[PDB]
Design a binder for this molecule. Sequence first.
Ligand code: CLA
Ligand SMILES: CC1=C(C/C=C(\C)CCC[C@H](C)CCC[C@H](C)CCCC(C)C)C(=O)c2ccccc2C1=O
Ligand code: SF4
Ligand code: SF4
Ligand code: FES
Lengths: 61, 73, 165, 95, 738, 80, 39, 144
Amino acid sequence: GPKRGSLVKILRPESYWFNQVGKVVSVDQSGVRYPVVVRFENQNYAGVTTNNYALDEVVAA
Amino acid sequence: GDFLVHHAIALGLHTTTLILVKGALDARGSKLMPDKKDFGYSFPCDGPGRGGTCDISAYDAFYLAVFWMLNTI
Amino acid sequence: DIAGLTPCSESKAYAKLEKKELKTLEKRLKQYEADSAPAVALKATMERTKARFANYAKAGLLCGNDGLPHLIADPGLALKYGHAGEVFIPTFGFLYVAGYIGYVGRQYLIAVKGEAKPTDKEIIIDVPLATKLAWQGAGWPLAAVQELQRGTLLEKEENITVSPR
Amino acid sequence: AYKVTLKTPSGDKTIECPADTYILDAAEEAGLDLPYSCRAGACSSCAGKVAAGTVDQSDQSFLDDAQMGNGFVLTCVAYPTSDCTIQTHQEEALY
Amino acid sequence: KVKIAVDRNPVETSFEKWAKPGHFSRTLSKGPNTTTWIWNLHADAHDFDSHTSDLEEISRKVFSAHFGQLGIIFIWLSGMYFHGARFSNYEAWLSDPTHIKPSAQVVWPIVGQEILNGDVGGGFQGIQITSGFFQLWRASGITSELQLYTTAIGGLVMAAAMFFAGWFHYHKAAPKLEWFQNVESMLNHHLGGLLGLGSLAWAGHQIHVSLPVNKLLDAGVDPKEIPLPHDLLLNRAIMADLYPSFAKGIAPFFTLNWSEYSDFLTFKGGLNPVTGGLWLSDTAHHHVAIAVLFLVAGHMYRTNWGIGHSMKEILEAHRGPFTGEGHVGLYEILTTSWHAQLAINLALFGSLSIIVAHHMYAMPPYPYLATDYGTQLSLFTHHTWIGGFCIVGAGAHAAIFMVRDYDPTNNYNNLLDRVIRHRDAIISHLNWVCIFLGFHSFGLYIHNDTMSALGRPQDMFSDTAIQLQPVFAQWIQNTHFLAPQLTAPNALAATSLTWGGDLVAVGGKVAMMPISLGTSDFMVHHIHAFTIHVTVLILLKGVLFARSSRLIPDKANLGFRFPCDGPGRGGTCQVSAWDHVFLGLFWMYNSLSIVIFHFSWKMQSDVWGTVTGVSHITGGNFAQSANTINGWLRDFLWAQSSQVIQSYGSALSAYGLIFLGAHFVWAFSLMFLFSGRGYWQELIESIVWAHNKLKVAPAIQPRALSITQGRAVGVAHYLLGGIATTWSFFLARIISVG
Amino acid sequence: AHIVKIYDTCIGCTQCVRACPLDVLEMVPWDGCKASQMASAPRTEDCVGCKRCETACPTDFLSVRVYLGSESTRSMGLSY
Amino acid sequence: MKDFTTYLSTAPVIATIWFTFTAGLLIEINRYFPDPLVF
Amino acid sequence: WTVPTLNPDTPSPIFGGSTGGLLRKAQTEEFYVITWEAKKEQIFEMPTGGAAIMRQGPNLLKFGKKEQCLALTTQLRNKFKLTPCFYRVFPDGKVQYLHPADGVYPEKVNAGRVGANQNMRRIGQNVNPIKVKFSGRMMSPAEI
Ligand code: CLA
Ligand SMILES: CC1=C(C/C=C(\C)CCC[C@H](C)CCC[C@H](C)CCCC(C)C)C(=O)c2ccccc2C1=O
Ligand code: SF4
Ligand code: SF4
Ligand code: FES
């Protein structure tokens, strides 16, 4: 999928960074349902700044 | 003075309407709670998690709007 | 005149309450010497009162049965009867300074959003950049209308939304 | 970059890890497959044990000071601050 | 082995950390992402237990903190003396303390605050101070505003010294833990030296300065006419003139013939009638007695020689049969928890301040003070409030300790342990007794008002109706009235006129009279008692179950302050001892408001006024209006409201201004009191949508306050509004009517 | 009796199980996540809904979700 | 010294000084030009 | 491993007796008892308040609710690394000395543990309650 460090826009509605952009840390090459690893700069109401994602939930933007 | 009090009345109307519409419309869900509809119109709270859920139901919102209404009348 | 409002430059209650004021003044005044600091202060107070009153009378203020100035709110009416100097110009100056301050605020905000330490510039400030944007902020209205004609003011439909919109 | 000697169940593997890169990320970029799950500093899956050298794991939330004082490290949120030696697959030893 | 143990240059001095927010704590040092960061940063700035774990360093921190505190107080006192010297009519009021109002604050000739510089006498234009600095300085005998000038100057110097002291002791040389722990040494030092010496030096100043100059004051000589104090010290001639004992100097004291010195060590009791102040001879005798007492006291414990005592040893010795280990290990405890000593001192000090105000209005010492009804009332209410707040802070820090420093492993079967055991029965009995008290004491007044509206006053509880006479208090009053006859043969007058007797009049104003006690006063005393018992109830519950409960067996694990444990199992809302002391604040405010109401009305009705008979301010209406709450509201509140509700156009108009403003803010608190931080954050999300809609979001993530923080903001504003409303009302009313 | 549910986002870091003061949770084998571990609630009738699980799940939406239901003496946490 | 400069560039002190400056501005304004009503 | 049984004849640890003790509910509905063997004799804290001393080896304590024993298990397991086994008892005398009774401890994966109540799906994949309408009772969408 997308490259590490690359910038993707998050599209998962239930996500804190929904409708926002993140940075792909990496993507797994195994059979994980959500291989995209994407950091964030602002923290959620939980304070976390990175979440796992399938390929569709993000877009390289 | 009548000018002034009339403007006060308009104010109170707007306040009441504002809180009421906020409560009523966010009932389906919210950024904090997208699944608000899964709790019925009346649920006590989601507790103190995520920084604290206090007075979060639209039922609670109307509950609050009562006071403003009383003040206006 | 308008709405049956007579000028207090003509009204009786105006001079009535003015004289009443001065009467209370001399009453508090009659308990001292002349050179006494309280005495001279009360005298200056009477002076200020009479001067403010002469100014209010010269202003041509319609002042009703209370003799107290009431203000008019219609561009057409104030212009036709010489009463813009009470609402029109004040509102205009206010909106000028307000738009100035808001615009320069957004200017600094954008400048610092174009930074790697947004929180740190939000706490500690760039003094010279602030001064610069302050000096430049006068042309805020022309700049804003330019950006409008370019449509560059507002953010597009990409801000976060709630799940039920 | 810092030389990170990883003492693994497969043997020792010394990798280079930049100051700005998490231990786990560098290990994966070097082709290794270390344990992980949350990748957020909030579990024990990626635990290692520092035998020598130093790390900065300041954003971790799962370990206590005594655990870190004995060398335990959440590799998913740990930066090297020196050449270091880290035994991997240490979750069981934490429990 | 007690000695001095210090560490040199422990802490450096740089403005580096000054540029670093949160450096003191671990997490805050990471910097702000959301807005609560700043709040918590502020909140924990002085939680040195949270800062680190070194007992010694924490001791040094609090040591420097005390240093700075003292410096602040020095600053304040000095500025007071400065403005007294420069912007006051104190010398005029010295020439006439009978018709000049003490005023020391003048304002500037601006948009209209100038009207407030009213006429207080002596051509002065300012604001009447209710502090009583005038009578204070006259009692001390200050004559020339030059003296106050010098005073303020020296205060500036002292403050600077104290702040440097804090700096040095924190960064240059900080003592060591054992040094901080040489407790018996500290006790002996303080107990003897500090108190005894202070009292003795004050007595010396009295004798050689004030008593002569105040003697001449009441003699009537012009203030600018008395010789200077040091001149008096020089010339024993005039001192022997005033009192011939001084002709013999001090050899009589060295011959134990104290009887001769009686000229200035009297035992008159009562007030100087021409002045309304206590007899200065008697005051000096009091203070010298206190001095000798504390001096001989300060030599109780062993420090570096065989003689002395061991606190530990004696406490271990004192144990009873029903009690198990008795008083063992408490030594260990107190040697270890800062909050323990803190809470102790706070409770004691609040109680003190209360007693202080009590005796102060009981037997006013200052010249012509009793006349200044306003000053009396003001200082009294002031110190009462201060004391109550000290009480609740005591409870707070006690619970804090019990959360943090507690350890079972050292206290096996101690007083503490059995308390922890039978706490449930204890608190149960306390509930029951408080409920009974409330019921009876409240229903009394209510049944009175009920019979009233029912036109059956025959069936009320009045001093005329069914009576409840405090036979005890009246019997004791007469007992004190008759005590000097036999239980005090060397006495001239009772310490208070309210024991019985005559009335003292200075300038027509009622200085003091004997006060009777009716069924009304019976009822109000019982009210006060019930309220205080409720307060102690809530506090005791908070402290006893701070660590656990049959509901929360692990409450000790949730920290001292914590919002709740969810809505689960019914709902954990408001379950911290923090919340408990919160509630206690509420009930305390209620209590003390009631008490000051009682005081004010009874004073106005049966004490104060002007002599001619007694032109009592409210003519004793209280006597028959207090039995019924309708009488209360109308005749006290509604009546005395006029002064404040028509004060406009006057220099006192600001009183009604702040009256309404306090109303305002007190209501403002209630939004916090009732609202919900969840709702609030929802609104936050809406408005940040609004902002980002224009790319104007702030970096720091806006966040609704914690439940606790909202509680605190609300309660602070609430108490502020209430106290300010009452304060304004009282001030305006008394300045107008007194 | 309250209701509790597990979702595929369970990264199995067990904090939920680690947080349940009532042992109403447990971990099982799985294959959805790298941990190969899924959270599991076999003793729901003991959950008082104190949700400390929900607090502990680091998952974006909480890999686990509580839903307060009816009330039994154990649900209310009554020892009397 | 630089530490000091940073301490002065800290936020609340800057808010402070700006407010003081503005307030003194307006107070002096009213001093020299008392009683403004129109224009 | 096999399910143990309970021995009512166990020397209970040393404690002076508190007032936060058991109630009617014990004699009426049920009550739990906790079983563990300490390596040595040592003082500890009572979850219901109080300091107590455990004996060497077999030690026994009973309680009504589950959370008491659970917090106590946490305390011992994290402060003294003991592996207690506490049961569920009823006034009938029937035991079930069960509260984490499951071979080992649940905080680790174990073979045989069958998943329960696990929505093998996301959470956003739930349906609007308009569809659970007119059921036999109040039922949440996530109930399905
Ligand atoms: C906020 C709404 C508002 C209201 C309630 C009023 C009220 C009034 N305006 Mg209008 N006016 C307003 C805003 C408003 N104005 C604004 C913002 C402007 C700036 C363009 C004007 C400019 C204006 C002029 C130049 C004149 C009035 C006039 C009047 C008065 C009589 C006409 C009328 O009823 O207009 C109703 C008000 C409105 C329709 C609101 C919209 C205003 C538009 C922009 C212009 C209206 C001009 C008006 C129709 C002129 C009528 C002249 C008359 C002799 C026939 C009346 C007191 C007349 C006057 O002084 O009569 C004594 C007049 O000559 N107004
Ligand atoms: C109104 C209200 C809010 C919303 C209000 C909040 C969070 C306080 C806002 C404080 C200020 C206004 C925000 C900080 C402003 C910054 C300093 C930015 C600079 C502003 C300049 C003017 C200095 C709560 O969050 C809340 C939470 C719990 C119980 C009650 C309430 C409550 O009543
Ligand atoms: S709801 Fe309460 S009992 Fe259930 S898992 Fe969460 S914390 Fe444990
Ligand atoms: S709910 Fe969260 S903490 Fe619990 S097992 Fe699942 S991913 Fe781990
Ligand atoms: S994988 Fe969870 S902490 Fe690293």
